Amino acid sequence: ENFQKVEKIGEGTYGVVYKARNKLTGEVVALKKIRVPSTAIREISLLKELNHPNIVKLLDVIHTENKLYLVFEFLHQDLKKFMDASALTGIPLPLIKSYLFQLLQGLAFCHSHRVLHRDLKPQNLLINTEGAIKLADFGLARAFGVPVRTYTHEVVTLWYRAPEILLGCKYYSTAVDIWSLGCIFAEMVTRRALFPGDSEIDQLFRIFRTLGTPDEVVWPGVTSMPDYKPSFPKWARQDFSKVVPPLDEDGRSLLSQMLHYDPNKRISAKAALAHPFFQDVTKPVPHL
Numbered sequence: 001e002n003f004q005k006v007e008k009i010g011e012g013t014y015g016v017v018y019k020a021r022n023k024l025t026g027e028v029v030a031l032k033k034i035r036v037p038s039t040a041i042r043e044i045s046l047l048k049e050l051n052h053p054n055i056v057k058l059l060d061v062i063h064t065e066n067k068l069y070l071v072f073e074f075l076h077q078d079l080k081k082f083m084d085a086s087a088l089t090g091i092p093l094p095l096i097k098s099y100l101f102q103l104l105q106g107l108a109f110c111h112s113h114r115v116l117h118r119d120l121k122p123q124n125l126l127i128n129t130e131g132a133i134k135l136a137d138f139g140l141a142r143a144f145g146v147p148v149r150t151y152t153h154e155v156v157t158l159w160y161r162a163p164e165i166l167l168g169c170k171y172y173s174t175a176v177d178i179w180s181l182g183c184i185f186a187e188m189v190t191r192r193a194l195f196p197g198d199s200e201i202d203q204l205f206r207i208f209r210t211l212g213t214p215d216e217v218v219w220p221g222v223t224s225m226p227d228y229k230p231s232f233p234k235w236a237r238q239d240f241s242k243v244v245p246p247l248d249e250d251g252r253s254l255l256s257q258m259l260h261y262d263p264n265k266r267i268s269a270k271a272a273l274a275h276p277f278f279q280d281v282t283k284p285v286p287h288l
């Protein structure tokens with residue numbers, strides 16, 4: 001009872017999440033109960049030191065009884081809510097640019113420490129009313145796995161999953177997080193998810209109908225992926241110009257690099273921060 005419940009924030013991947021108050025310090029936190037493997041201990045331990053202004057701070061890790069409780073900094077809204085609330089008008093392009101720039105800085109930090117997110121999605125991007133955005137749950141996938149359904153049976157979304165994961169490669173490189181952020185960038189710009197698949201094969205075929213069915217020219221090695229089938233239909237690639245209007249040419253070039261099929265060709269977070277799309281980046285104050 002170090003922490004008093006204030007209210008239920010929601011249902012997470014791994015257990016319930018409460019906004020809570022630290023009895024001694026007076027601080028308000030998001031307290032996640034994780035529903036314990038030595039993988040999970042040593043991973044979580046690394047994560048308490050992986051601190052950066054665009055990563056939601058892991059304040060503490062309590063391991064008591066059967067359970068693991070992670071205590072995080074509290075932020076008041078997620079990007080999924082902010083996008084739904086911005087549906088009529090869209091998030092303004094300078095704010096989209098500022099958020100992408102801040103998220104790439106969070107990714108560049110984590111990846112320089114060899115830690116991946118692996119399940120980036122709008123629900124895991126948290127914003128404050130000052131203009132910042134931060135990545136939540138970084139590292140939890142390697143600690144705990146990414147399940148097919150959550151503890152309350154909700155389906156974990158596939159919409160932001162990289163194609164190498166969907167084709168059954170079990171080696172995750174930092175490129176998986178660049179793909180997910182590219183999908184979120186496209187969703188902020190057009191106000192619709194880019195590849196809203198509802199099964200692994202629907203997700204792959206939505207990817208292939210936009211970017212073309214991958215072959216050994218664009219992705220050497222693809223036909224040796226565990227789940228690759230020579231019988232996948234062959235779709236032609238569309239132009240980006242049709243996929244994310246009214247994004248300008250620099251943003252379309254950057255998106256295209258974040259969505260290359262071969263993880264080895266996909267742009268890194270450090271290289272993305274240098275892209276001319278960010279020449280004019282600013283830090284606007286958002287409408288909440």
Ligand SMILES: *CCC(=O)N1CCN(C(=O)OC)c2ccccc21
Binds near residue numbers: 168170222224225
């Ligand atoms: C899933 C393991 C892996 O890293 N692969 C799959 C095979 N592959 C490759 O070149 O095999 C001849 C490949 C190519 C690009 C990215 C990942 C992988």
